[PDB]
């Protein structure tokens, strides 16, 4: 939703990182806010932004909505 | 944002799951 605020400026973040191998100097090369996440270069925020998802709450209800569907299959 | 959960799940699926899963699959060769 911070990306929704400024879709030109802010880079779309992927999942966060947990390396125990990033010693100190790596972590300064990944901090984007509090997160150290990867930058999601897979076009997903664009498609979810044209769908009409404008929150994280709809993403949680959708994620549960596909855990249910994978349990169905 | 439960920020502590990758510090649990990334090791327990990253390393100890391909230890015990090596045990389950490799003993499962002989079961």
């Amino acid at each position: 939703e911070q990306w929704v605020a400024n879709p030109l400026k802010t880079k779309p973040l992927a999942h966060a990182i947990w390396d125990p191998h990033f010693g100190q100097a790596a972590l300064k090369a990944f901090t984007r806010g509090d997160t150290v996440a990867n930058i999601s270069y897979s076009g997903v925020y664009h498609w979810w932004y044209t769908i009409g998802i404008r929150n994280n709450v709809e993403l949680y209800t959708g994620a549960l909505g596909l855990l249910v569907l994978s349990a169905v299959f | 944002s439960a920020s502590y959960l990758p510090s649990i799940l990334v090791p327990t699926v990253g390393l100890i799951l391909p230890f015990a899963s090596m045990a389950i699959l490799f003993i499962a060769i002989e079961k």
Binding site: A63, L67, S70 | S1
Partner: peptide, 27 residues
């Protein structure tokens, strides 16, 4: 954005994991 929904998520995919091992030990 919260924490409890993450617990609910790993509950639902833990159950889905039980269907994964459940389907896995029949084929």
């Amino acid at each position: 954005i919260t924490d409890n929904q993450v617990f609910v998520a790993l509950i639902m995919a833990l159950v889905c994991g039980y269907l994964a091992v459940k389907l896995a030990k029949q084929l």
